[PDB]
Design a protein around this ligand. Structure first.
Ligand SMILES: [Co+2]
Ligand SMILES: [Co+2]
Ligand SMILES: [Co+2]
Ligand SMILES: [Co+2]
Lengths: 223, 223, 223, 223
């Protein structure tokens, strides 16, 4: 199967809406109560570093309380050395959107050497119709208002960055990454079933057959 | 054929730094004092406001050479390009080692907080450098470096960054880029024929047939 | 007198509203027609680099045309080696504000050495009541909506960054800087007399006596 | 007295790396293999989500030592602080040369596009380094370096960055900082007594009377 590490925001009544950390499985390793705010723009902050070896997420809304979750995990023992990073989304049977307004990533590998740092950094504040640097999978598309629509507008969409990412290296004193993305989940229904995730996977990851709904387009089965 | 814009350093039959817009017949050149066995540093910069491409090549103890050319890249290059390093050796024993490479591109829209940006920094190449497309005799890992031409007689190598780059956009108020790379040209011969270039091209550019020597692996012929 | 280099936006009918470059004097070295948009947030982009030796400014408004001005000048021969950078504003006799919504600066000195770069970078997207890292002069204050009010709310205000800035160095192959700031000029009058400027001066620069109005708080006299 | 948080490397009467929260009696320490005459690299990091301070010291060929401490800096440090480097030599001949220093602070608000940040990078100090406050025996320019203790018997030197730093804000969703510095401790004695520290303090901190040796110039006494 693909190898997945993902921080997901989900309202699927499996059972309150929550933010969760997933290490190779949809049955989250850790979750926190999340107050999904329909129609309001949210902001997810994800961070990791090899020294602490702890993956942390923070989701907040303006004038708001924030939800936060952290999980101690050494990504070196989970993920391959080279990965692709991306955004996922799955809609239950409700009318709703999963608009990503902006996305940014930064990765750094600092060696044992003097002045040896390797780094990648992309910042999307405005997606275009032909966003060549992104691999779009599922129902995802770009250009709609200069945004990225992950889900159809039971839909599943995804968008991974083109260039593979060097997440870890056996000779680095401190590897690290940090991702930030602003989303807008709008639904006419009062209690919609929806989910987005920032995930890290093998370079050639693709939508598993039947990864719909609570499987977020990341996993082929919970069982 | 391909579309090429490149800043080249060449000693072929006099050593000079030069700007090439779609042709090997440089649009502008400057006298260059090629220092055998010494690490050099090329700084290339451009911005849509000034609309002027500029390069600076210096060696420690410092002989710096610099060349600028007024050109609106919007009318030359496609919207999406791949960036890279090229090198061709004449009939001499020599190396074209790249010790570090870094790039930074930015698109600032008319909107407020409009910025789109990409940035990579290689200070240590690895044997499996998945984020680089190697063409020709180029390879990586040798000392954690990038060897453009084969290390030991008419050799051509190239290395382009994986992710396409959004170099211009009709709705940007200022687009800009900046590249920096440190090279080491070592040759036992007193007056070796050699050349490196930082070039920008269409995403699917490849080594033209017969682009050896003076043609730097960029051009298929001297027109 | 103080040493001033500034990019100013002014509507004082000395005579249309314009954007201008000032090198040690209020009688601009170069100016461009500017369409001052009352009540709308604007964005000034200022850039310079020692290779091109050309100072450029771009002012745009959303859904807009942009005004732009560039001036060839070697700052090394104008400014001291160490300077403080800041924002200025002067109101004529009209009711109006000169709110700065965000400010950011970046300076870099790249030496002849391999991996020798020196750099400073600040980004203000939200000013607080006690903004200790800014020196406020005149009527300027902070905290009002998490913004900086340059002018009283015939007022003159200014705000310079605390840390002195190393703009140039005789041993740098390329010195450079870039500043961006978003302003909101609101006035009930149809044709108000106002002016803001991003200026660079000696570390101990202060408001000259009688620098009001068309002198932007930068110069003590035009004559 | 002053308020100090510091990550110190000390060999006094055993060499270890340690975290100090308001007292020389380190809260946590790790065995350190001080390599005389070899350039070392300290990486210090913190973030308000994890609320854990972490350090990593490594030498090329690589013995890395690392220490972390769970602490909420919001309850220890004032809101505005100055950051710096300290050093104290015992009765031995030795130097505490800092080859490069860099810092990065960020305050991300609850708002959208909320970020506030400061960042400096010194890779080459000059004789008149106006943006640094030197205290004690510290000086700059010697080889384009920073000599914390006097170069040739009980010497204490310190260098703090000029601009105050906004390290925390009650309305931030994630505050964070990161510091990196390369040092060179050269001593003719086989087992020299010495110590350097990266510390954070109140803006007006100065060398306490009698802060020599084990007290690193940070503390006036061992309590
Ligand atoms: Co779940
Ligand atoms: Co030529
Ligand atoms: Co004027
Ligand atoms: Co101790």
């Amino acid at each position: 199967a693909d190898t997945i590490v993902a921080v997901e925001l989900d309202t699927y009544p499996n059972s309150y809406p929550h933010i969760g950390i997933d290490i190779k499985s949809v049955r989250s390793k850790k979750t926190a109560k999340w107050n999904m705010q329909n129609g309001k723009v949210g902001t997810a902050h994800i961070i990791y570093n090899s020294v602490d070896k702890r993956l942390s997420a923070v989701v907040s809304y303006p004038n708001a309380d924030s939800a936060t979750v952290s999980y101690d995990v050494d990504l070196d023992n989970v993920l391959p050395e080279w990965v692709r990073v991306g955004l996922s989304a799955s809609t239950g049977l409700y009318k709703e959107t999963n608009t990503i307004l902006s996305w940014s990533f930064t990765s750094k590998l600092k060696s044992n050497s003097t002045h040896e740092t390797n780094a990648l950094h992309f910042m999307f504040n405005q997606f275009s119709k032909d966003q060549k640097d992104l691999i779009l999978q599922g129902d995802a598309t770009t250009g709609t208002d200069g945004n990225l629509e992950l889900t159809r507008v039971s839909s599943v969409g995804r968008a991974l960055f083109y260039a593979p990412v060097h997440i870890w290296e056996s000779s680095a004193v401190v590897a690290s990454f940090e991702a930030t993305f602003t989303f807008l989940i709008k639904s006419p229904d009062s209690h919609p079933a929806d989910g987005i995730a920032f995930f890290i996977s093998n370079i050639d990851s693709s939508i598993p057959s039947g990864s719909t709904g609570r499987l977020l387009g990341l996993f082929p089965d919970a069982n």
